[PDB]
Paper text:
The [name] of [name]-[name]-2 ([name], also referred to as 3-chymotrypsin-like protease or 3CLpro) is responsible for the majority of nsp processing, cleaving at 11 conserved sites along the polyprotein including self-excision of [name] by autolytic cleavage of its own N-terminal and C-terminal autoprocessing sites. [name]-[name]-2 [name] is a functional homodimer of two symmetrically disposed protomers that are each 306 residues in length (33.8 kDa). The active site of [name] features a Cys145-His41 catalytic dyad, which orchestrates nucleophilic attack at the carbonyl carbon of the invariant P1 glutamine and the formation of an acyl enzyme intermediate central to efficient peptide cleavage. Using C-terminally substituted [name] chimeras, we have determined X-ray crystallographic structures of [name] in complex with 10 of its 11 viral cleavage sites, bound at full occupancy intermolecularly in trans, within the active site of either the native enzyme and/or a catalytic mutant ([name]).
C6 (form 2), C10, C14, and C13WT have also crystallized in space group P21 but with a distinct unit cell, two molecules in the ASU, and a unique conformation of the donor substrate (we term here form 2 - see also below). Interestingly, the others diverge from this canonical binding, we term here form 2: in C6 (form 2), C10, and C14 (crystallized isomorphously in space group P21 with two molecules in the ASU) the substrate sequence is kinked ~ 90° at the P3 residues and tracks instead between the dynamic Met49 and Gln189 regions. This altered substrate trajectory appears to be coincident with the close contact of the donor C-terminal domain in this crystal packing. P2 valine, unique to cleavage site C6, also maintains a highly analogous set of interactions with a markedly similar S2 pocket, but with a less optimal vdW interaction surface as a result of the gap from the static pocket edge to the shorter beta-branched side chain of the P2(Val) C6 variant. This P2 pose is also remarkably maintained in the kinked form 2 structures, including C6 (form 2) which we have captured in both binding orientations. No major altered side chain amide rotamers are observed in our collective 52 structural visualizations of P1 over the varying substrate products or acyl enzyme intermediates, remarkably even amongst those with markedly varying main chain conformations such as C6 (form 2).
Numbering used by the authors:
A (entry chain B), B (entry chain A): 1 to 306
Write the structure that this text describes.
Amino acid sequence: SGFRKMAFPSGKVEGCMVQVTCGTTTLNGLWLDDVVYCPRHVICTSEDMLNPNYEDLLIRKSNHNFLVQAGNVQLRVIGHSMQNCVLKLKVDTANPKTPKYKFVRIQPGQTFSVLACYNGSPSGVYQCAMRPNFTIKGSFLNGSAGSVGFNIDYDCVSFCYMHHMELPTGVHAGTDLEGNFYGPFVDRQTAQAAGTDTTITVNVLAWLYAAVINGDRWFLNRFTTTLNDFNLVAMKYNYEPLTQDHVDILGPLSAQTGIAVLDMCASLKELLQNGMNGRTILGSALLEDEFTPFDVVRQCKVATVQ
Amino acid sequence: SGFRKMAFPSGKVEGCMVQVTCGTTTLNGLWLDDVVYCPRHVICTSEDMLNPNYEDLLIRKSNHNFLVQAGNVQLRVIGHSMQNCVLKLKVDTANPKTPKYKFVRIQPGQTFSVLACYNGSPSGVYQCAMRPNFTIKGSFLNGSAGSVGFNIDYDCVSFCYMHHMELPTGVHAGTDLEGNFYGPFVDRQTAQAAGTDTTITVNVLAWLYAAVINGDRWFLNRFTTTLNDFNLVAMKYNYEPLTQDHVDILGPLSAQTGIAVLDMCASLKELLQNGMNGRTILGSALLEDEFTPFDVVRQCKVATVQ
């Protein structure tokens, strides 16, 4: 029993992290086979960030302008190119610790693990969710760009996020591993802002099921509702509408607890309207939305099969 | 910016995890050089756990009775001994992935990263604190015993916890890597009560500093108090006494923010006596106590030196 914010083990990703230096600018790269992937603003000085002309800046860089280090090992750059907002640096050495991997592009609501790195050195691991507004609520300082987000299944690393930038609300934006930003964000100088975020309803429901599985059930009532009725409540409180697909995905949690999904929706409606009144759920005094149904099933080993 | 529950990168520990099976009982072991460390209850079945003569039970076990698998590949046991509540199984193969390591005893209030494992396979990583009542609020199911807790300092892994058991309140107990339990617990099947837990005051202060560093300053009003007056309030709210030693270790956070420790104590006193006014701090609607001062300094790279 118990329930914690849990990341995937990070070892398979640690062996892929390198430092990339161009002049005086440094960030992290991801070394898979004989390519290092990193954010393209490594080619910018502080002066360039007034208005970076990335294509013009890159044309004056040779292979020798890129210093790539895996720990103390120097990886010689033998080619370079730009793909959307990432650079691909071809190196002379293939990474012997390259795991089985895929590059994937995820949807809002999905969670992933982040290996935060500085100067090519892994510092820590934590869990993030892709927010409905395509930001993430990470923990990133200057020098962390190029840190990646990932999930692991059957020893295959699915890389879904490369970190690029921080917005003045304290939230983070980045790309897939082909260099395409999530959301409307750009790595230019435009005075941009994130859209209004909402709460990930299906994840809150998953977390309420985790709470019941772990014995916290004071919030259960006898009532039920419908998708139509519940979604009027969701709109009022800035929650994402619940879809029937979400209801179906919650199936294994409903199956193991015996609590119908629309019954759990009626419990959530009451929590939204009246709050918790000095009580907690899984150690929290607010409704948590960064655990997916998959996250709960995996961490609590939810199964009716024996 | 940002502030997350952050674990150390787990790769160095992943390569040490193995499965130990004795009869129908399976749990995890820690493989360092030519020794596997695991909880001694692997030698027990339902038949002999109320009053297990572990010395007698171990005598009935030969080296062949211990099946050790590293990545589903068998390691041959060539010796076995018991040290307090752990077994040391000598194997004929030294682990080529053994990191630099130390076995350490942590103090109450200190944090560590847990690599949760089942059948020798790492499942996830999360952060825990050693509670004042010497339990931990983990996430552990049957088969997770032998999972370990650790911190990393300069490529040295300091192992501080090996998981053994769950108390009926849903919290967890275990040993150091010398096999001595934290707190008044035994691996015997006696009914065991944890002491009433208390809140880790110095950690709440550290987390309030983390909030300030991240821009969350609504609870600062330039008030200050004395150490004795603060400790009178702490006592009323089930908070641990704050010692001058605790004040000292908050130094780096006070240094970067310019907020004296006793000013932050006055802020915390106000939050305790009057509540959080419905507000959230760093994504929490309650006061969080599982970040140490060092955790904040590490994650936020706190320093006045440039």
